């Protein structure tokens, strides 16, 4: 099945890149809640975090 069989292996070898790429893309990934205006909320909510009312 020579003409087809060669491509079939080469497809498997290709797949091995797709897994590796998912792991490198996820190695350096960041995540947020609420971004830029709640950087400001850190200044304020850190003074109020020291107290007890929670």
């Amino acid at each position: 099945a020579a003409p087809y069989a060669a491509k079939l292996k080469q497809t498997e070898n290709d797949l091995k890149d797709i897994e590796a790429r998912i792991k490198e893309k996820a190695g350096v990934k960041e995540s947020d809640t609420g971004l830029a205006p709640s950087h400001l909320w850190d200044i304020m909510g850190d003074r109020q975090r020291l107290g007890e009312e929670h």
Binding site: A26, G27, K29, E30, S31
Partner: protein, 51 residues
């Protein structure tokens, strides 16, 4: 000497704060692990330099 300084050093080693068994539910890529403690609930908690 190997003997007596094995006893004296095991008295230190036996003293713990409690060291648990957890299971990993899933990872998060902020470099933290969501671990469900087997009796207790879930806590996202940082990892050591060996893992």
């Amino acid at each position: 000497n190997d003997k007596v300084r094995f006893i004296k050093d095991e008295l230190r080693l036996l003293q713990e704060p409690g060291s648990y068994v957890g299971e990993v539910i899933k990872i998060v890529s902020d470099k933290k692990v969501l671990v469900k403690v087997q009796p207790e609930g879930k806590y996202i908690v940082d990892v050591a330099k060996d893992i």
